[PDB]
Design an enzyme around this catalytic site. Structure first.
Site, short mmCIF file in Angstrom:
data_model
loop_
_atom_site.label_atom_id
_atom_site.label_comp_id
_atom_site.label_asym_id
_atom_site.label_seq_id
_atom_site.Cartn_x
_atom_site.Cartn_y
_atom_site.Cartn_z
N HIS A 46 1.28 -3.35 1.76
CA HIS A 46 2.07 -3.53 2.97
C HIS A 46 1.43 -4.20 4.18
O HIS A 46 0.22 -4.03 4.48
CB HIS A 46 2.61 -2.17 3.43
CG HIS A 46 3.20 -1.35 2.34
ND1 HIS A 46 2.87 -0.04 2.14
CD2 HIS A 46 4.06 -1.68 1.35
CE1 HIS A 46 3.51 0.42 1.08
NE2 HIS A 46 4.24 -0.56 0.58
N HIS A 48 1.29 -3.87 7.90
CA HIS A 48 1.54 -2.92 8.99
C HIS A 48 1.61 -3.70 10.30
O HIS A 48 1.13 -4.87 10.38
CB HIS A 48 0.51 -1.78 9.00
CG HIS A 48 0.64 -0.84 7.84
ND1 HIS A 48 0.90 0.51 7.99
CD2 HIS A 48 0.61 -1.07 6.51
CE1 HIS A 48 0.97 1.07 6.80
NE2 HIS A 48 0.81 0.13 5.88
N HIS A 63 4.82 0.41 9.28
CA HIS A 63 5.07 -0.85 8.57
C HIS A 63 5.56 -1.92 9.54
O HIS A 63 6.25 -1.61 10.52
CB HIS A 63 6.14 -0.65 7.50
CG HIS A 63 5.64 -0.03 6.24
ND1 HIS A 63 6.39 -0.01 5.09
CD2 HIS A 63 4.49 0.62 5.95
CE1 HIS A 63 5.71 0.59 4.14
NE2 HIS A 63 4.56 1.00 4.63
N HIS A 71 12.92 1.34 4.27
CA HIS A 71 11.95 0.84 3.31
C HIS A 71 12.55 0.49 1.95
O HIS A 71 13.39 1.19 1.42
CB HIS A 71 10.84 1.87 3.15
CG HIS A 71 9.79 1.48 2.15
ND1 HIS A 71 8.86 0.50 2.39
CD2 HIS A 71 9.52 1.96 0.91
CE1 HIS A 71 8.05 0.39 1.35
NE2 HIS A 71 8.44 1.25 0.43
N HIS A 80 11.65 -3.55 5.01
CA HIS A 80 10.83 -4.00 6.12
C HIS A 80 10.30 -5.38 5.79
O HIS A 80 10.07 -5.70 4.59
CB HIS A 80 9.62 -3.09 6.27
CG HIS A 80 9.96 -1.63 6.40
ND1 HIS A 80 9.21 -0.64 5.81
CD2 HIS A 80 11.00 -1.00 7.00
CE1 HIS A 80 9.73 0.54 6.10
NE2 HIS A 80 10.83 0.34 6.80
N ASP A 83 7.19 -5.14 3.56
CA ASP A 83 7.31 -4.50 2.24
C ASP A 83 6.99 -5.46 1.10
O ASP A 83 7.90 -6.11 0.57
CB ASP A 83 8.72 -3.97 2.04
CG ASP A 83 8.97 -2.69 2.85
OD1 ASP A 83 7.98 -2.13 3.31
OD2 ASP A 83 10.10 -2.23 3.06
N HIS A 120 -2.64 0.76 -0.20
CA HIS A 120 -2.50 2.23 -0.19
C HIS A 120 -3.03 3.06 -1.40
O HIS A 120 -3.25 2.57 -2.53
CB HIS A 120 -1.05 2.63 0.13
CG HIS A 120 -0.59 2.29 1.51
ND1 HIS A 120 -0.45 3.24 2.50
CD2 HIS A 120 -0.24 1.11 2.08
CE1 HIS A 120 -0.05 2.67 3.61
NE2 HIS A 120 0.10 1.37 3.38
N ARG A 143 -4.43 5.08 3.47
CA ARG A 143 -4.84 3.68 3.55
C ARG A 143 -6.24 3.53 2.92
O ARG A 143 -7.24 3.97 3.47
CB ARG A 143 -4.73 3.20 5.00
CG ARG A 143 -3.45 3.73 5.64
CD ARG A 143 -3.20 3.31 7.10
NE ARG A 143 -1.86 3.74 7.44
CZ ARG A 143 -1.14 3.42 8.52
NH1 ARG A 143 -1.61 2.61 9.49
NH2 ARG A 143 0.07 3.96 8.62
ZN LIG Z 1 8.09 -0.45 4.19
#
Ligand SMILES: [Zn+2]
Ligand SMILES: [Zn+2]
Lengths: 153, 153
Positions: A46, A48, A63, A71, A80, A83, A120, A143
């Site tokens: 992702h 962020h 995100h 999401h 997002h 994503d 992640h 993370r």
């Molecule tokens: Zn997301």
């Protein structure tokens, strides 16, 4: 910019280099490279919101979601901007990345230069994990490594 | 007002957090924070062209200089966009930074988001060193620490 790069690092062994290329400003962004030090299997990938590592990866915030959607996975209409699904680590902890996305940009409002890329702890459930956290982070957990997305040559 | 931040790290003990803030698109940028692990005295403080840390601070490349000018100090008409001069480290290796600059920007053609902030080995001679190199980098020498300038909350 038409090129970008991100160096991924964290508190443990997870490290990698992710490249970005966008030949046309209204075309797709190619996202490629490699990450090592992961457990075997699926890991959320992702963008962020903040390019802020003052406190480690947590300081990158939520995100990147400027259109305020719930999401989803990269192929979903509802997701997002940040994503980018999951990357896949092999038996040796190595994940080869090769993604093409038309929602992220290297310019304009969906611009991710200066934001943070994060790999992640677990698999991103793409919004179908069947609980509240699923519609937010995809249950991807902690993370492992991150880096600010930077303008590249 | 857009805001940015940079975490400085290198191979050595130099580390710091630098904040950037710009209230209006034609306004000046406040930059501030602190850097520790420096030798007492002056240190070049420059924005380099690429936000690329793939080989350390070297990969950030040259000074951010989109107007192809000669290197100078921040107050000089003739300077690189990236020319923020010097920072001062006290006897405990600590450099408090508090600057205002109107050449750099967090938006537009002079935008530094995604580029690399670098703190140097020696003093920047502000192009008054009397040699060819003075008019390129100010003889600031080595890259002690860098970070990609990322978007901040
Ligand atoms: Zn997301
Ligand atoms: Zn310069």
């Amino acid at each position: 910019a038409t090129k970008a790069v991100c160096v991924l690092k964290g508190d443990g062994p997870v490290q990698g280099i992710i490249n970005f290329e966008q030949k046309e400003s209204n075309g797709p962004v190619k996202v490629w490279g490699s990450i090592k030090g992961l457990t075997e299997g699926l890991h959320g990938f992702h963008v962020h919101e903040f390019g802020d590592n003052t406190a480690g990866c947590t300081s990158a915030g939520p995100h990147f979601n400027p259109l305020s959607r719930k999401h989803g996975g990269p192929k979903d209409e509802e997701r997002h901007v940040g994503d980018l699904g999951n990357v896949t680590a092999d038996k040796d902890g190595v994940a080869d990345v090769s993604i093409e996305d038309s929602v992220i940009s290297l310019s304009g409002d969906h611009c991710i230069i200066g934001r943070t890329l994060v790999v992640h702890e677990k698999a991103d459930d793409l919004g179908k994990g069947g609980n509240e956290e699923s519609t937010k982070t995809g249950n991807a957990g902690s993370r492992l490594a991150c880096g600010v997305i930077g303008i590249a040559q």
